[PDB]
């Protein structure tokens, strides 16, 4: 999955 | 002559507390451990998990004294909770430690009260580090140990030899509610600075870098020529961002934070998920086999679930200069598109009350009244929503 | 309010309460639907409204739908599910909504289907289809469009 | 040169023994361990449970000798059994430490006997002292460790690193029949007195002080203007009681058993409810904020398993002088209320032997006859109960 | 609870 | 819960 | 699989 | 739940 920072 | 533990203990275990829960939701009585950070302010942090929902809040020291303490922060993101001694009067706080400096191998002490029996110590070492994946959405760096740790260990210490607190005993891997060996714990480092947030605001302020990202595998380092088999790879830098601001581009490979090596992503991710915004930090990067360390300062950073708590699936703003509350998109079956909310509506207000903002509506969800009304308005239309 | 709508014409705008129906008090919003929905279409009423702690008496004129008009069943005389309704001046019979699990959807018709023709008859409107299923055919071959395609669907 | 426990377990482990057993009540079969308490007499402890309703006593050494033993006495409020080896030939005994002097965080290494597979090592720490509530009737005063301990190390030694012996593992708290890192055994101190006291009489006399009480929260203690937020609470003396000729009323808060603090009432309530008639004590209480010591000795109390060994259900002792034996109480629905047996039967004699005493009664349970006639009588009326 | 000692 | 050995 | 305290 | 009419 696509995480963010 | 024997070895033993207890000259440390007698000195630190006062430090430790356990914390008895009411609360109702269908009423629940919960309990736990808790760790004394602040004598003189009687500052105790604990394990969120422990402390949501709850009405009444009675905290019991090792010595037997009891009192009430009332809520300070809390953050289920990271599962850290901060509560404050009602008349804190000789009292007990622990030093904590630079849990960076942590190795594989490191013997640990565990602090807790299982099952309320009591104040129980047990011993173990440290298993491993950076372990994440038990909550994937949560900043989770567990430090793994085999010091036995049962229901009641949340909130306890983990502390080294010397009795200075490395890390906040959090969940178990245990498939029968029984400890078999794994115990996980919130490294100090992270408590510290998520603790620091709750004193000054009461809340976190959530920074951001502004990339995205995945892990690192032996497979991608073949296919991209890197050397080192695990990391932050950098899928994409956003605009404007500070990361973006500060020279990091796409391609990059992370390999430490403040000069320290990281474990993985998910537990990078977790490391600045707890620092305030605008923390100034070094990073370690690898481009075409070349290292670039920049300095980074944090930037600031909707959902109808954060404005209602219980209703979802519909994404919305505020509309231009006291304009209503628009809204962005809604999913096709979701809480909110069961109450035939659609994508473009502009919430003008409800029961009667103007609303210009997400800031006035709220106003009025604290007045809590049985039943809503917002009156918004699709196209050139005016209709009407109802809630409750 | 719906746009184009006798009570949007009639000047009823939305937030109001309304009291009673020529003159007879309304006990319910369910009771007035049951009125309404057995008085013949063009029934001149008279309508009691509170908006604002003020009193409104309006005029009013039931109107057709062009929306759920007419459902399956009482053409087919045992296929229920399928609400419909006719499309533009003799353009066919576009169906407004299918309902999950119901002798209709269970043949396969969907939303935004438009019946041109059925049995080398060309179908305009639900009296020409009508027309064909009071010759009660042993099969009916219906030919509808579904957007820009011309398709048939079977039955019996 | 590596450190290891290896050095202190040659030693100590001959005294740690295995025991097999074989008896009925519907036949079963069971194990447990025991620790050689005196190598020349043959002296084995363990506990109740594990010797309660047992036929055939077989015990395995360390190094697989088997021999046979015999019950000394047995205490199921304590848990604590005693044993006597037949034939002792060749055994090393234990060193035994004193248990008022341990800590929290002392090394502790645990051997039994798990699941028969012979004698099994486990090492931990003092996770707590003190701890009870399991059985609230039982004089519980629990060591908590987190040495692995299952079924089979009943009996077991709880050991420090010189190889003395500081309790004897007991029971576990296990949600899955499975050790969680939480053993419970009985300190060394309390097992001293128990055996002591069994070696001559067999049994324990068991003397009182005449005080009843309850245990001291910080609740009860902000109600008494009280400082002590933990210890015993003086409800009331009784008359011609040691405490009432001692000096001791009520509204007293009990702190320290000789000098040395109370964990709680339920701890207090087992370490002198061991200790032999006599022993002189000084405590410490606390009446009105002031601390006062007084130095007391214990008095006499005055009050079927012990005799029959298989029948039980009934407490009997003498009557009078040279009254015959007398039953006190029957519980309903036990091996001796199953025969007729009721409360106030007076057993005088049987088959035709005169019953002045338990002394003169066990003489024939020792002869062991086919048929057994017990002339009781009830009231004045003369009747008879016929068993086997 | 009372209890005897 | 609580067990015996 | 997981388990909290 | 509003309903047409």
Same mark, same amino acid.
């Given at each position: ?5 | ?11 630190? @275990? ?9 609360? /109702? ?101 440290? /298993? ?39 890390? *906040? ?20 480092? @992270? ?115 954060? *404005? ?81 | ?10 000047? $009823? #705008?939305?937030?109001?309460? $309304? ?34 702690? #003020? ?19 009482? $053409? ?12 533009? #001046? ?16 269970? $043949? ?49």
């Amino acid at each position: 999955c696509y995480r963010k920072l | 002559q024997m070895p033993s533990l207890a000259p440390m203990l007698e000195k630190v @275990m006062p430090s430790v507390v356990s914390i008895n829960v009411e609360g /109702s939701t269908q009423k629940f009585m919960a309990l736990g451990s808790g760790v004394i950070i602040d004598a003189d302010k009687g500052y105790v942090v604990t394990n969120n998990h422990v402390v949501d929902n709850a009405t009444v809040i009675k905290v019991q020291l090792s010595d037997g004294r009891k009192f009430d303490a009332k809520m300070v922060g809390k953050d289920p993101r990271s599962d850290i909770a901060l509560i404050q001694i009602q008349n804190p009067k000789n009292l007990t706080a622990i030093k904590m430690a630079d849990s960076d400096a942590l190795r594989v191998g490191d013997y640990t002490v565990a602090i807790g009260n299982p099952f309320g029996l009591g104040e129980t110590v047990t011993s173990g070492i440290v /298993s491993a580090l950076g372990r994440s994946g038990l909550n994937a959405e949560n900043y989770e760096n567990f430090i793994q140990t085999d010091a036995a740790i049962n229901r009641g260990n949340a909130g306890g210490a983990l502390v080294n030899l010397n009795g200075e607190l490395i890390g *906040i005993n959090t969940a178990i891997l245990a498939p029968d509610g029984g400890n078999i060996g794994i115990g996980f714990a919130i490294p100090s480092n @992270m408590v510290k600075n998520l603790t620091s947030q709750m004193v000054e605001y009461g809340q976190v302020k959530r920074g951001e870098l502004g990339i995205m990202g995945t892990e690192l595998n032996s497979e991608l380092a073949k296919a991209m020529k890197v050397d080192a088999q695990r990391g932050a790879f950098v899928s994409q830098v956003l605009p404007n961002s500070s990361a973006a601001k500060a020279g990091i581009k796409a391609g990059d490979v992370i390999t430490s934070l403040n000069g320290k090596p990281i474990s993985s992503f998910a537990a990078l991710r977790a490391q600045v998920g707890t620092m305030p915004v605008g923390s100034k930090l070094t990073l370690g990067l690898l481009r075409d086999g070349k290292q670039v360390n920049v300095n980074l300062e944090l930037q600031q950073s909707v959902d109808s679930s954060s *404005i209602f708590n219980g209703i979802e699936g519909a994404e919305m703003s505020n509309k231009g200069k006291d304009q209503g509350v628009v809204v962005n998109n809604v999913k096709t079956g979701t809480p909110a598109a069961q109450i035939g909310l659609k994508k473009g509506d502009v919430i003008i207000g409800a029961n009667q009350q103007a609303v210009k903002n997400i800031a006035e509506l709220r106003k009025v969800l604290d007045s809590k009244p049985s039943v809503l009304a917002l009156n918004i308005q699709r196209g050139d239309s005016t209709i009407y929503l109802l809630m409750q | 309010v719906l746009p184009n709508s006798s009570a949007a014409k009639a000047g $009823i #705008k939305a937030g109001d309460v $309304i009291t009673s129906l020529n003159g007879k008090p309304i006990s319910s919003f369910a009771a007035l639907r049951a009125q309404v929905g057995t008085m013949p279409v063009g029934s001149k009423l008279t309508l009691g409204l509170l908006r604002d702690g #003020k009193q409104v008496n309006v005029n009013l004129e039931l109107q057709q739908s062009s929306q759920n008009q007419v459902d399956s069943s009482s $053409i087919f005389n045992g296929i229920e599910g399928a609400e419909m309704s006719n499309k533009g #001046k003799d353009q066919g019979v576009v169906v407004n909504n299918v309902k999950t699990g119901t002798p209709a959807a269970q $043949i396969g018709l969907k939303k935004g289907d438009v019946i041109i023709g059925a049995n080398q008859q060309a179908v305009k409107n639900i009296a020409e289809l009508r027309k064909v299923l009071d010759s009660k055919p042993s099969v009916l071959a219906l030919n509808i469009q579904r957007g820009d395609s011309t398709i048939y669907l079977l039955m019996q």
